[PDB]
A paper describes a structure:
SEC analysis of the P-side mutants trCPK176C, trCPK176S, and trCPK177E indicated the formation of larger particles than double rings. Cryo-EM 2D class averages showed that most of these particles had a cubic shape. 3D reconstruction of trCPK176C with an overall resolution of 3.0 Å revealed the cubes consisted of six orthogonally arranged rings, with no additional stacking of rings as found in trCPE150C. The center of each octameric ring contained a blob of density, which disappeared after removal of the His6-tags (trCPK176C-noHis) without affecting the cubic architecture. Another blob of density was observed in the center of all cubic assemblies, indicating the presence of putative cargo. We measured masses of ~1.3 MDa for each, a mass higher than expected based on 48 copies of the protomers and consistent with a central cargo of approximately 250–350 kDa. Although we cannot assess at this point how important the central protein mass is for self-assembly, our results clearly indicate that no molecular species other than the subunits of trCP mutant are required for the formation of these cubic particles. In summary, the cubic assemblies of selected P-side trCP mutants are composed exclusively of CP-derived units. 48 surface exposed C-termini can be modified to carry (removable) affinity tags such as His6-tag or Spy-tag.
Potyviral CP plays a role in virtually every step of the viral infection cycle, from transmission of the virion by aphids, virus assembly and disassembly, regulation of genome amplification, protein translation, to cell-to-cell and long-distance movement. The C-terminal high intrinsic disorder region (C-IDR) is partially conserved and packaged in the lumen of the virion, supported by the helical ssRNA scaffold. Here, we show that we can control the shape, size, RNA encapsidation ability, symmetry, stability and surface functionalization of nanoparticles through structure-based design of CP from potato virus Y (PVY).
Author numbering:
A (entry chain Aa), D (entry chain Al): 53 to 222
B (entry chain Ah), C (entry chain Am), E (entry chain Ao): 55 to 222
The structure:
C-alpha cells in the first residue's frame, strides 16, 4: 500500500485540500517571478522614470516589444527605445535590470501570453520573425510566436515550439 | 559458507528468514524518520504555524517541489496559491533543516507526489516542469517526473529509464 | 428561427451564451442534491451514527458498491472491514431512502470511485467484481468497472465501450 | 476537477481512511457469505448432528470433498456420505441446506482456497477431475483445481480458469 | 485462507491430507450401499428367491439393463434366458424399490457391465442396444455403451464423448 508521510503517527499532508489544490503551473513555477517581485519592479521603474501611474502602460508596451526583438539580457548601461510615432524615445535600462529580481527574463515572463499574441497580429499583416529567431536560424514562420527570450514553456505549449526553443538555446 | 568468528556464526538465520525490510525504509535515498521529524518540527517552528494548518502548507510545498525541484536557492521563496492569491514562504527552514538533503527529506512524498501527478492528469493532461524542462514527451510517464521519486523494485522499467534520461 | 410566442422570443440568448451547466448536474443519470441530502440524512439517522464517523461508513459503502453493484437485496446486509474484523450494516436505509434509484444516489461517487479503483491499482493489480463477473480482461479499463459510473463527454471511447459490453 | 460528493458543503467521505482502506475482495464480496452467516450455519449443523465441538472438523472434511464431487445445490431431503475408512457414513442434508444463508454455495465458498488445494494433492497422486467437470466436459486436467461449484473467481484467478467456469456454467 | 469460525479452523488438515474417497463412493451418480442393500433385500423378497439363486437372477438383470436401459416400463417384465427357454420376471420390485433411480442402483454394476460387454466382444463382435439405437459405429467403445455407466476420472476421453453423443 501507499506509505503516506507521517511524523509521529499523523499524516503531514491534508488530503481534503490536496485533492482540491490544482495550482496553474505558472503561478508556482520558477521561470516566472512572483507577483510580489513584479510589483516591486513595476513600482521601481515608475519611480526611476518619473512616469505617472498613467502612461506607464504605454512605456511597458515599448519594453515588451523591445524585449521581443532585442532580448531580456541587455547591458545595464544602455538605453532601450520605443517609437513615439516616427521619432525614437530612448529610456535608460538601469531601473529595468537593477530592480529585476531574480532576473529580467523571469520578470518579463509575465508578458509571455501577450508577447505571442502581439507577434501573431504583427504576423497577421506581414512577416515578422522576432530578431531572437533571425539571429538563431529560426526558419519556420508559424513558430514565430515563440521566438522571444522570455517565453514560458508550459503544459499547453506545442511540442514543436518546445523543440525549437531547445534549438535557439545554444 | 556462513560467516563466523570463533566457531559460531555471526548471523541469526532464524531472524533473517523473517527479516524483510522494505527497500524505502533501509535505503539511503530517503531520510530517516528521526531526520524527517526534526525537519518537520523545525519548519513548523520557523513558520509560526501549528498542526492545524501545517499539513496544508505541506500540500503546497510538495506541489512546488514537483514543479520546481529539490535543489532550490536557499536565499529564495517557495510559492503557494490560496485560490487566485499568492502565498510566499521562505526556503531557509526548508533547506537548512533538511538533513542530509532536501530530496531525501522530500522522498517521503514520493508515493503522494505520484498520486497527485496522476490525480491531476485525470480530467486534463498535466506534466510537471521537471519533465517539460528535461525533454520528456510521454504523458504516461508524467507520474514519475519529479526529482524526489524513490526508485524501488516496483518501479516500471520504462519509468526507471525516463529518470536516467531526465537526470542527464 | 428562434422560438416565439406573440412576437417575442421565449428565450434569452444573453443568458444562454453563458449558461453552461456541467452534464453531471443536469443529467438524470445522477440524483439531485436535494435527493442526495435526503438519503444521506436518512442513512445517518437509521444507522445511529453522527457526522464524526458517518464519512468513514460511506468509505466502506462506496467500496462495497464497486465490488457488488447498486442493485442489491434490500433484505440483506453490506459488509465493511474494520481491519481483519467484519462490520455488518443493514441495506434497508441504503435502498429505501435512495430516490430514484441507489445508482443515481451512488453516481455522486463516480469520481471518487474512479480514483479508488485506480488508487488500488497502483502497487498491485486490482479489478472490481463488476468486471470480473462481466468478462472484462483489460486492466486499463478497471477504473470504469462499476455500476454507478457517470458516462460524460470526457469518458474515453474505450471506456464507453466496456460499459455497453459489461451491461450486456 | 473532481467533484467530491458533498451533502451541505462537507465531503461525505473520509479521505484519510479511504487511502488506507483496501479491503480484500473476498471479505466484502457477495459470492461469499458473511462470517456472521457462517458461524450461525456452522453452529446449527453441530446442533442438528449432535457432533461435539471436536470431531466437527472431520465432518466438515467430508462435506467439503462431498461438495466438490457432487455440487452445492443438493436435495434438502437427501443424505451426503463420507468415507470412514472403507465404510460409508451417511449424514442428513437438512441442517446443511436449511441453515445455509443465503445459499450453500456462498456458505461453501469459505472453503474455496482449501478446495483447490485438496484437488491438487489428490491430482498429485493420480488423475482426479471433480465430477463437476466430468459432467461438464472439462477436458484440460491442469484446470481441475477450479472444477467445483463453490469456487470464488477473484482478481488472482487465472484467466483461463475464469473462461472455463463460463463454460461449465451452462 | 483457511475457513474459520471464532479463531479456529473448521477443518482438520491432518485428516484431510489422508482423506481420499474414491469418486464412485462419494458421487451421487450411484446409490449408497444402504440403498443398494434395501433394493437387493426387497427384490429378493418380492421374487420368492433365496441367496442360492438370487445372484444368478442378477446376472440376467444386469445383461438386460445393458441391452434395454435403466428407464423401463414399471408395469412390464424383464426377460432372462434359461438356455433356449425364456424366463419372465416382473419389474415392479426392480423399479419400485430402486431409490433414488434404478440407474443409481444399477451403477454398482458399471465395472461388471464393462467387463461383460468386453467379455462378449472377445470371440465375436457384440454391441449393446443402447449403442445400436443411439447411432454408435465404433466397436472399441462398446464397453461404455450402457445407461448406468459411471463416468469417473479414469474414463477415456473418447469414452466420455460417446456418452454425450449417445445421451443426445
Amino acid at each position: 500500500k501507499m506509505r503516506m508521510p507521517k511524523s509521529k503517527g499523523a499524516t503531514v499532508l491534508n488530503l481534503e485540500h490536496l485533492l482540491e489544490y490544482a495550482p496553474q503551473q505558472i503561478d508556482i513555477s520558477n521561470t516566472r517571478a512572483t507577483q510580489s517581485q513584479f510589483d516591486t519592479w513595476y513600482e521601481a521603474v515608475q519611480l526611476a522614470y518619473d512616469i505617472g501611474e498613467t502612461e506607464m502602460p504605454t512605456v511597458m508596451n515599448g519594453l515588451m516589444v523591445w524585449c521581443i526583438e532585442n532580448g531580456t539580457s541587455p547591458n545595464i548601461n544602455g538605453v532601450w527605445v520605443m517609437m513615439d510615432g516616427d521619432e525614437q524615445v530612448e529610456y535608460p535600462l538601469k531601473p529595468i535590470v537593477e530592480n529585476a529580481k531574480p532576473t529580467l527574463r523571469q520578470i518579463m515572463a509575465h508578458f509571455s501570453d501577450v508577447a505571442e499574441a502581439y507577434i501573431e497580429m504583427r504576423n497577421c499583416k506581414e512577416p515578422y520573425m522576432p530578431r531572437y529567431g533571425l539571429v538563431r536560424n529560426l526558419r519556420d514562420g508559424s513558430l514565430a510566436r515563440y521566438a522571444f527570450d522570455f517565453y514560458e514553456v508550459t503544459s499547453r505549449t506545442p511540442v514543436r515550439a518546445r523543440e525549437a526553443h531547445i534549438q535557439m538555446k545554444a
